[PDB]
Design a protein around this ligand. Sequence first.
Ligand SMILES: CNc1cc(F)cc2c1[nH]c1nc(Oc3cnc(C)nc3)nc(N3C[C@H]4CCN[C@H]4C3)c12
Length: 190
Amino acid sequence: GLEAVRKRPGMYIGSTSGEGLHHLVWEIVDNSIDEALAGFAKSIQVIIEPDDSITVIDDGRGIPVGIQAKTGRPAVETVFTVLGSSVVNALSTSLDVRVYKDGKVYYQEYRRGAVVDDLKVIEETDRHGTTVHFIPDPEIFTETTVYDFDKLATRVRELAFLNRGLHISIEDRREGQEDKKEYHYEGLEH
Ligand SMILES: CNc1cc(F)cc2c1[nH]c1nc(Oc3cnc(C)nc3)nc(N3C[C@H]4CCN[C@H]4C3)c12
């Protein structure tokens, strides 16, 4: 399964250069955009964390957490472990997901694609949505693991335009260069 992704990442993300590094972000963001298209997510945050890891937050319904009859596993686990989202998981040292749903925070983490523990309720919550955080694997991204804020921001702006009505932001939390841009193109209320 995902072991094939780790050994032939070029076949799944096109390049293991800086281009592939950035592609990981778009694979995750595309899931959030699908939840905006479904009509439930209204706001997406993309964050470059101080260690060049990435957090993507949406306020949609939250990935389904119920057990699937076919797999016997929670749907959210299958999202990350069965062969875009699972490709990002495979090519990350660690990926953690938090699903905010029905007053509960469901949490699972993976390491180089492998499950750490069964999905668990860790907290109560009043919000809804999905947060994915991932650390790209330098064993895969041997040229660079350093994100380009302008490159991400340029595409985030384009995505806001193409998904008119969506609020989407990009934030850099790295030392000496903290920045944030927020985008929102108005609908019929304009
Ligand atoms: C950082 N965010 C993020 C990241 C991410 F990797 C996945 C999701 C994600 N946010 C999500 N929200 C939903 O919402 C749904 C809730 N309920 C249903 C029935 N479908 C979708 N579903 C999600 N799923 C379920 C599948 C439907 C199409 N895309 C797949 C991933 C995500």
